[PDB]
């Protein structure tokens, strides 16, 4: 069939699975583990399918897909069959990632281009979004995701500072989070965490926290730095999943739903599973 | 062209810092990883390793049903989400699901004896007799139990020894005191019987015997044997730090046997049961790789559980996540050994993860409830309810589980989120109403699927149309003008047409509002087709009650949108009507 599966995610009911390939098709599949019933094909892009993502149920089951065209062509089942419900193109230069935000964060659509620019819009059925962009990195953004959870501002007016936080990863070895500001022009950058000597690849935040927020920033320097935020709002300190160069070229590194079990996809086609050890460092569970 | 896109593909991959085969590592809902293949779909050649769980009872839902009738679900008032704070669990809720030769049996059984009281059938005259005897009770049982486990080992050695004297010693490491004496008499040995009669008690007098008899012997004599002088050390109250050391005896007899010695004889009533096990550790520490040995150490070290836990952990220790979770929660909320409301949270995630990955969905939800932190407890409950509740309805024992004290609202909202995926917009709206989210359920009939009680309704008797009306009489009217703004348009429409409230003012109010309304859902699917029905009905309804035939209401008819036959008909009829007037002479 496909000789190569690049990456492949699932919906939020766990009945569908969307395969990003490289022959420009998005094959929507039905998840039954290894076997799948191919229900649809959506060819209509240029070059490798880098990323697709499924919408959080309360803003459809919308599927926003990016290829090397540098455009997100959004697909939506209208009539029980796939069609095109939208188009985007404010940044073209290859859209690498294409994410939907948590329920509380809204139907925000995270675009991250390799021109050092990043869009952040809203999905509308009546149309209209205001074009808000903030510059992340400079040599490009090879992956983007979504910050942990929305915060609370207390007082008499909620949703003031922090709020929707955007985490990105450029090719200039720099990983950091934001803080949506409304009193200082562009998004005031936090702290530049330089701990990389080769381009940043994948970034994932842990939807499981205790007293610190974990941020797995992968790189092509064959290590994964785990950024432990001290008391969750403290500084980001250096905690090493492995201190040494793995003889594996690491790609994705995505956390589980519960737990701080992290899967890192090694270049030798072996997905190690890491748990944090007897100390603050990490040891493999497999 | 085709050959020349092979080449481009290659360049695009190299310059963007890709090489080799792309593999991923996204956790599925089964929580296995799916890696590339020739016949490759999302997942091929699973590089998920087997679950770390393999405890009998965790794969039995018979266990899960039983534990609903122990401790019972409850929530704080601080966060209304589940955050269990009582315990009615003991370490006697699994003991027969695994073998009786196994270390798993031993681990659950031991813990109830150690940390929880083993009560008496009566109540003593004074509470220091209450309490003293309570601990002594725990100890009594322990001492015999240890002897049964170590049993076969000692027995083996007794069999293989064909020396009388040696067999006599081997017995004393059990509780074979009886029979130790018996063999000694028969074998013509008085000396062994005398010392054996004193077993089962220690005193300052007995200490005095031990030190002096040894000194007189190894001074006045030519010196007693190595092992006799070792016994003197056990009776004086320091065998391992004693002048003849028994630390060599690890090398032949298990760390639990070594522990047995001090526990039965040395420092029994000059000590409490707690301090007594600790004294043995100060004379000779037990190995750290024992799961069941670590327990003694925790009991002994008292409320320095935390300190020891981190130390032992950093010296090789294997324990199951089920065990860590169950222990920390029960003991804290029995007040027998307090724990932190942080070590508990760490343990709740660990076991809960292993359970999802095992494919145990009831189990994984239960466990999660014992999480402390208003946010966290919140976070976790939400997620696991959201992802499917079909398997919270699978049995009647999963009904009594989820319905017990997990807010009804969460159950209904989960249903609606699933229903968006199913395309079940009809039932969606109903479930959002019940999940107390009046505004959310507005959005599911107006922004995703227009009412089917104004599209598919039969116009003949309008039976479905008045179901629409009546089920807003079942939905809040005590707080109506805070959730009706799409639903309200429906309300004024229904009262004007169904119940016949034809007032000129009522007519106008609906039309002006309905222009706006038409102007944002004339492009939403289904909703748009329903607007046209509404318009046909209102126009028709005005002739049917008497057309007021003023300029302004003529205007009104055209200001509410018209269809293809309608605009043609009006122009057609107006010339005929004029003709008819001039007809009669």
UniProtKB/Swiss-Prot annotation, chain A:
SMART domains: WD40. The keyword Protein transport applies. SUPFAM superfamilies: WD40 repeat-like. GO terms for cellular component: cell periphery; COPII vesicle coat; endoplasmic reticulum; endoplasmic reticulum membrane; nuclear envelope; nuclear pore; nuclear pore outer ring; Seh1-associated complex. WD repeats lie at residues 1-39, 44-85, 90-131, 136-188, 195-237, 245-284. It comes from the Eukaryota. Pfam families: WD40 (PF00400). Keywords: Cytoplasmic vesicle, Endoplasmic reticulum, ER-Golgi transport, Membrane, mRNA transport, Nuclear pore complex, Nucleus, Protein transport, Repeat, Translocation, Transport, Vacuole, WD repeat. One of its GO terms (biological process) is positive regulation of TOR signaling. Its main location: membrane. InterPro entries: Sec13/Seh1_fam, WD40/YVTN_repeat-like_dom_sf, WD40_repeat_dom_sf, WD40_rpt. The keyword Membrane applies. Gene3D superfamilies: YVTN repeat-like/Quinoprotein amine dehydrogenase. One of its GO terms (molecular function) is structural molecule activity. It is found in: Cytoplasmic vesicle, COPII-coated vesicle membrane; Endoplasmic reticulum membrane; Nucleus, Nuclear pore complex; Vacuole membrane. It is a peripheral membrane protein. Belongs to the WD repeat SEC13 family. Functions as a component of the nuclear pore complex (NPC) and the COPII coat. It is one of 5 proteins constituting the COPII coat, which is involved in anterograde (ER to Golgi) double-membrane transport vesicle formation. First the small GTPase SAR1, activated by and binding to the integral ER membrane protein SEC12, exchanges GDP for GTP and recruits the heterodimer SEC23/24, which in turn recruits the heterotetramer SEC13-SEC31. The polymerization of COPII coat complexes then causes physically the deformation (budding) of the membrane, leading to the creation of a transport vesicle. Present with 21400 molecules/cell in log phase SD medium. The basic repeat unit of a COPII coated vesicle is composed of 5 proteins: the small GTPase SAR1, the heterodimeric SEC23-SEC24 complex, and the heterotetrameric SEC13-SEC31 complex. This repeat unit polymerizes to induce membrane deformation into a transport vesicle. Component of the nuclear pore complex (NPC). NPC constitutes the exclusive means of nucleocytoplasmic transport. This is Protein transport protein SEC13. It comes from Saccharomyces cerevisiae (strain ATCC 204508 / S288c). The gene is SEC13.
């Amino acid at each position: 069939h496909n000789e190569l599966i690049h990456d492949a995610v699932l919906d939020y009911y766990g009945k569908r699975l969307a395969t990003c390939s490289s022959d420009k098709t998005i094959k929507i599949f039905e998840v039954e583990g290894e076997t799948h019933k191919l229900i649809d094909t959506l060819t209509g892009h240029e070059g490798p399918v880098w990323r697709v993502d499924w919408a959080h149920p309360k803003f459809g089951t919308i599927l926003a897909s990016c290829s090397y065209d540098g455009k997100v062509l959004i697909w939506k089942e209208e009539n029980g069959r796939w069609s095109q419900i939208a188009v985007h193109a404010v940044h073209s230069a290859s859209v690498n990632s294409v994410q939907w935000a948590p329920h509380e964060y809204g139907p925000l659509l995270l675009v991250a281009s390799s021109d050092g620019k990043v869009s952040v819009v809203e999905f509308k059925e009546n149309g209209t979004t205001s074009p808000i962009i903030i510059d992340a990195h400079a040599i490009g953004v090879n992956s983007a995701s979504w910050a942990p959870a929305t915060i609370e501002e207390d007082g008499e007016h909620n949703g003031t500072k922090e709020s929707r936080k955007f985490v990105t990863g450029g090719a200039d070895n720099l990983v950091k989070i934001w803080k949506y500001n409304s009193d200082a022009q562009t998004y005031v950058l936090e702290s530049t965490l330089e701990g990389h000597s080769d381009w940043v690849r994948d970034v994932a935040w842990s939807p499981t926290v205790l007293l610190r927020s974990y941020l797995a920033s992968v790189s092509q320097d064959r290590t994964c730095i785990i950024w432990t935020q001290d008391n969750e709002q403290g500084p980001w300190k250096k905690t090493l999943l492995k201190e040494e160069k793995f003889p594996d070229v690491l790609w994705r590194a995505s956390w589980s739903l519960s737990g701080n079990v992290l899967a890192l996809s090694g270049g030798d086609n072996k997905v190690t599973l890491w748990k944090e050890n007897l100390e603050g460092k990490w040891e493999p569970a497999g | 062209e085709c050959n020349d896109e092979i080449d481009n593909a290659k360049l695009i991959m190299k310059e963007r810092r890709f090489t080799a085969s792309y593999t991923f590592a996204k956790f599925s809902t089964g929580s296995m990883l799916l890696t590339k293949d020739i016949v490759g779909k999302s997942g091929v050649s699973i590089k998920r390793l087997p679950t770390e769980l393999q405890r009998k009872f965790l794969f039995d839902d018979v266990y899960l049903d039983k534990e609903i009738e122990k401790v019972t679900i409850e929530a704080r008032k601080s966060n209304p989400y589940p955050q269990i704070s009582e315990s009615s669990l003991l370490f006697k809720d699994a003991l027969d699901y695994m073998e009786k030769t196994s270390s798993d049996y031993n681990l659950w059984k031991l813990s109830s004896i150690l940390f929880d009281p083993v009560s008496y059938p009566y109540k003593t005259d004074n509470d220091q007799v209450k309490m003293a005897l309570l601990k002594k009770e725990r100890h009594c049982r322990l001492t015999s139990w240890i002897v049964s486990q170590i049993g076969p080992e000692i027995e083996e050695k007794i069999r293989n020894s064909s020396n009388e004297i040696e067999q006599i010693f081997l017995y004393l490491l059990l509780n074979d005191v009886v029979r130790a004496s018996k063999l000694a008499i028969e074998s013509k040995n008085g000396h062994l019987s005398v010392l054996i009669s004193y077993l089962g008690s220690n005193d300052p007098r007995i200490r005095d015997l031990a030190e002096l008899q040894l000194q007189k012997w190894s001074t006045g004599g030519c010196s007693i044997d190595k092992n006799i002088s070792k016994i003197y050390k056990l009776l004086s109250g320091s065998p391992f730090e004693g002048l003849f050391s028994l630390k060599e005896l690890e090398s032949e007899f298990s760390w639990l046997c070594l522990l047995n010695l001090t526990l039965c004889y040395g420092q029994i009533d000059e000590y409490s049961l707690e301090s007594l096990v600790q004294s043995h550790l100060d004379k000779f520490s037990l190995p750290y790789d024992d799961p069941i040995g670590v327990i003694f150490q925790l009991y002994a070290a008292n409320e320095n559980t935390e300190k020891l836990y981190k130390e032992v952990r950093q010296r090789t220790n294997a324990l199951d996540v089920q065990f860590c979770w169950y222990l920390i929660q029960t003991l804290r909320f029995n007040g027998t050994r307090v724990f932190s409301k942080e070590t508990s949270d760490e343990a709740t995630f660990a076991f809960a993860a292993q359970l999802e990955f095992a494919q145990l969905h009831g189990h994984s939800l239960f466990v999660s409830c014992f999480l402390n932190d208003d946010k966290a407890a919140e976070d976790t409950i939400k997620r696991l309810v959201m992802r499917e509740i079909t398997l919270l309805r699978a049995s009647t024992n999963d009904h009594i589980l989820n319905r017990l004290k997990i807010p009804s609202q969460l159950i209904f909202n989960a249903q609606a989120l699933k229903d968006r995926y199913e395309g079940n917009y009809l039932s969606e709206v109903q479930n959002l109403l019940l999940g107390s989210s009046y505004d959310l359920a507005e959005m599911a009939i107006v922004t995703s699927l227009g009412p089917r009680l104004l599209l598919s309704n039969n116009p003949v008797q309008n039976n479905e149309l008045k179901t629409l009306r009546e089920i807003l009489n079942e939905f809040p009217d005590s707080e109506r003008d805070k959730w009706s703004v799409s639903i309200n348009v429906f309300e004024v429409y229904l009262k004007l047409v169904l119940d016949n409230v034809e007032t000129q003012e009522t007519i106008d109010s609906l039309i002006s509002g309905m222009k706006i309304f038409y102007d944002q859902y004339k492009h939403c699917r289904e909703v748009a087709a329903c607007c046209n029905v509404m318009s046909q009905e209102i126009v028709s309804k005005i002739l049917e009650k008497n057309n007021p035939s003023i300029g302004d209401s003529k205007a009104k008819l055209l200001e509410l949108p018209l269809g293809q036959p309608e605009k043609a008909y009006l122009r057609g009829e107006f010339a005929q009507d004029l003709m008819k007037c001039t007809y009669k002479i």
